[PDB]
Write a protein that binds this ligand. Structure first.
Ligand code: CA
Ligand code: CA
Ligand code: CL
Ligand code: CL
Ligand code: CL
Lengths: 602, 598
């Protein structure tokens, strides 16, 4: 006898919006009913703040960044290495009936027979009699797209929840629109609970409850402004409930059997989900998985509550790029902004379809926000450190305070070690990485592990007093390796005017680098620091780029310059660059259209 | 000097999908630019809810139903009477250069030299120097076929418009597929605007804008489920924008000159389009036309806004028959269902290629719909009455409420007089009508005007209490005229069990009526009300039918029994009997493929 599994997944939502975790959240009788014989997790987190990279993590039990899958949505899907597959593939091979309804959003090439059925209406019903099953289902009721309503809805559509009772995130302006948007999101939670009840009630009528582990969770944090798309805790924290079936209690430690509703405070990550299903199904862990099962025969509640670690990743989201790593350990959250000159408010078309987003930015421009509220739109610190017990909304950066020097240094080392040993493939720009790594990222990883260690050491030079690293950094700017010149230029950008001594070197890179992104970075530096007008050269370079991703990278730089210097760009693209193939081209073209329409006007 | 005309026609689309009419509609900057110096009509309607009969109407300025042209697509095209022709023909004869690109879809036989040129790429560029022109062009971007995408598109192809903000029609279930489909249709509107912009910009660059009336409109309402193919307002309402040329403002009443952007609220019908062009060209109205110009020297905006009448017609769409008439007057909409035992959801192959259609039907069968949403699939009332001001989506049938008795009675009378006086030839079944009327429908009409009054009076006996009409009805059941027996049987079918006293007469019609459709009606009645198996009998009558339309009509009865009682039919056709051939064959394959299974 093997247990069944059900994954009930709502889109984009954090735990604060649920009454189960928050006194001013939405009542959800069906999910609250699950919790009655269930484990309720107070600290479950994805490892990235958007759908495709989070879903990818869930399936694989492994970090996307080490497999060249950190790019939403992908330009190239990546072929999986031999010793790593999806949990649906593993369960299917082991004889489970596996149904998915219907979202996938994988950044890997799908394994053959990945599911018994992945489509609208796919169901455990279609299993063979007595066959154990794994059902996954997505509800889009809470998706970001549901908060793209017109501002006039404030007066035209009433919310069930009362916006006047809303207690806003500290980084948000206290406005009617924001309190309204919040209430709309509370309303969507009431709704999705109803919809999910349909499925839970079928399992009940069919008598499957006590043979089945039922998981409910959000597919990442969100979705009010400053959450989804960022590795702040807002982007990562999700509700998580596991109703523990009576007939398979014996697979778990007595502490975890959920004979009464039980709270778990240990940090659970999305990398842990697949290893957990493997263990419960009696299957061995994948030799390339990063996560660890949180449901084991020998795992006590105390054991589980000691877990306190989560690494988070953010790179590309639609047309918009930035590079941020998050590292939470115990009560501290450490943030590394590798490209601090990119504000978090750097324009993304889809984010700003939410009217609250537009209002926030408008209020920033009008100088009506306090320092905590306006930080989202400004140049970032190279490092941020937060005490989540004292400051759960990450509003007070401790990194520059002398009494936290040791804490900063240690978490700095912890993150560098993690990213170097993984190794984090995203220190190669996507426009170089994915075309090569797509055949087998493990192969790329093995070949270039030390290169990535070098890239990380180069950029982290910007964490040192300029006088101590200037000679080292100068030599890197003159390196033969183009991606080392890239990361040295990025260090130079972090230094700002402190590195102005490098001007002739920077000017030469601007004129003559064989790499177009390296030219663009130098132009960026000179535009930001020395009054150079970048429009003409960047317009040319975008036109010169011989592949979509290189152009897109340069368009992101144009966007940063547009947002900071308030200048327009006129973009034309290089003429040089099957139903499913159509879909890919449409998505890519959308990215460029989004950039072109935006950059056109100040 | 005479004005030019351009007709820019998008296919299958209603007004709610344009920003111009609806806050959640698609932006269409080129169309919207016509409005800048134009008239925007808020209540333009076709007189029928599908391409060929609506196209026919546009061209003739006259009701297809009075000309045996009410069938889509036509089995038999109808020759025009001497005093009625197309606007393209009338204009050509007056010296205009007429071009059509390129969709015709006419239910009449085309006049000789109907167009100066009618083909792909035909253009006003080929006119003689100085020659006034009429250019018609059709875009298929918004055609129904574009919504026949697979349900998997929801995951694979994201829409440009946001489907989450869509405010769905009340008869629709509020599902992801329906909102996604809606968003897809919005996308096609943004696309078709770009396409029409090409022709508008040519007219601009050539300096023809101020000598040319430019009309933009849809060729009937649609095209989400419940619209195209039905005479609810969904099937009929279309956008209509007319850019008024500076140099021919003198032809118009000051109110209509669009010196400022102007909204017109009066009801404009498709029969009105041809008379409008004749007047603007300085030509007389045809003596057989039904419409009246809405652009004129002496017509003020108030006079135009007083118009509030639309008559609408539904008979055959591909393989599916049903007979419905709509009568809109002022704030009221009246619907007469002559064959109320045919649910609107009666199967049609092309309709149900739209995924949203199949989901709707599935949710109906799963009993997951409310009563507003599920009426589409149910037996119809014989009459419906809707207050379009309080209830613009026609969801609350007022017709049985006592306080609306007089309104029902008056509009019933208004409709009856209209259909008798036209006269409406479709009270003759198509299988009999078109073979005979194809030579000249006006002569058929003259010969048989009283016969049609009688048919209308026969079927309308089903509006009375049974006891009050049973004697009269029985007599018609025993009439010597086959089509009176036909309409008497349709009356009996509407009365259902209330008429069971006629059982012997009905069983006799089943055994012995010379008319095979009459037998099939009796078999239909006996199956629905007496549990008598129709399967064998209808298989044999279809096989026995000596002409395609008779077989097709009997197959429709089989479809109604299939959908209502769950009965399968194994269909064989009579051995006795190019676009035409493919189209007819298509009808029968669709019926044969569908009936075979439950
Ligand atoms: Ca999501
Ligand atoms: Ca059409
Ligand atoms: Cl610790
Ligand atoms: Cl005669
Ligand atoms: Cl007569």
């Amino acid at each position: 006898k093997r247990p069944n599994f059900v994954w009930l997944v709502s889109e984009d939502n954090s735990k604060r919006y649920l009454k189960l975790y928050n006194a001013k959240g939405a009542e959800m009788p069906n999910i609250e009913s699950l919790a009655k014989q269930g484990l309720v997790f107070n600290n479950a987190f994805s490892n990235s703040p958007v759908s495709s990279t989070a879903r990818t993590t869930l399936a694989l039990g492994a970090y996307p960044a080490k497999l060249a899958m950190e790019y939403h949505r992908p330009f190239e899907r990546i072929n999986l290495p031999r010793e790593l597959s999806t949990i649906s593939d593993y369960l299917t091979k082991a004889g489970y009936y596996t149904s998915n309804d219907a979202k996938e959003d994988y950044n890997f090439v799908s394994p053959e027979n990945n599911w018994s059925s992945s489509k609208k209406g796919a169901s455990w019903h279609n299993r063979k009699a007595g066959q154990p099953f794994f059902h996954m289902q997505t509800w889009k009721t809470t998706h970001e797209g549901k908060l793209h309503f017109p501002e006039s809805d404030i007066e035209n559509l009433s919310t069930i929840h009362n916006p006047n009772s809303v207690e806003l995130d500290p980084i948000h302006p206290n406005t009617e629109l924001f309190r309204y948007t919040y209430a709309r999101y509370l309303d969507l939670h009431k709704k999705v609970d109803k919809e999910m009840g349909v499925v839970i009630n079928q399992l009940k009528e069919e008598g499957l409850l006590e043979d089945t582990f039922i998981f409910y969770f959000g597919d990442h944090g969100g979705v009010l402004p400053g959450s989804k798309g960022f590795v702040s805790e807002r982007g990562l924290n999700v509700p998580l409930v596991v109703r523990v079936p009576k007939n398979f209690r014996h697979l778990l430690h007595k502490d975890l059997q959920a004979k009464l509703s039980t709270r778990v405070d240990g940090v659970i990550s999305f990398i842990d989900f697949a290893p957990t299903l493997l263990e419960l199904a009696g299957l061995p862990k994948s030799k390339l998985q990063d996560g660890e099962s949180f449901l084991s025969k020998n795992l006590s509640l105390d054991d589980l509550n000691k877990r306190n670690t989560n690494f988070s990743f953010a790179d590309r989201f639609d047309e918009k790029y930035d590079m941020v790593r998050g590292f939470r350990k115990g009560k501290y959250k450490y943030i590394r902004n590798y490209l601090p000159f990119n504000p978090d408010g750097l324009f993304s078309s889809y984010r700003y379809k939410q009217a609250a987003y537009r209002e926030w930015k408008h209020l920033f421009k009008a100088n009506k926000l306090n320092s905590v509220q306006s930080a989202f739109f400004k140049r970032k610190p190279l490092e941020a450190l937060y005490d989540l017990e004292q400051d759960p909304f990450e509003t007070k950066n401790l990194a520059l305070l002398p009494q936290y020097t040791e804490q900063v240094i240690k978490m700095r080392a912890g993150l560098q070690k993690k990213l170097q040993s993984m190794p984090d493939l995203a220190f190669y720009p996507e426009s170089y990485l994915v075309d090569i790594a797509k055949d087998d990222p493990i192969i790329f990883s093995l070949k270039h592990k030390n290169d990535i260690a070098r890239f990380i050491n180069i950029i982290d030079m910007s964490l040192q007093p300029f006088e101590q690293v200037k000679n080292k950094l100068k030599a890197v700017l003159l390196s033969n390796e183009q991606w080392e010149r890239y990361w040295a230029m990025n260090a130079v950008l972090a230094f700002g005017d402190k590195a102005n001594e490098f001007l002739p070197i920077i000017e030469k890179i601007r004129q003559s680098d064989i790499n177009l992104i390296n030219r663009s970075r130098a132009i960026q530096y000179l535009a930001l620091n020395n009054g150079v007008s970048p429009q003409l050269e960047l317009e040319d370079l975008v036109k010169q780029a011989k592949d979509p991703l290189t152009a897109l990278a340069i368009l992101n730089i144009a966007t940063q310059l547009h947002d900071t210097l308030g200048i327009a760009f006129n973009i034309e693209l290089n003429k040089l660059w099957t139903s499913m193939e159509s879909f890919h081209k449409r998505t890519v073209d959308g990215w460029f259209k989004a950039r072109m329409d935006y950059l056109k006007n100040i």
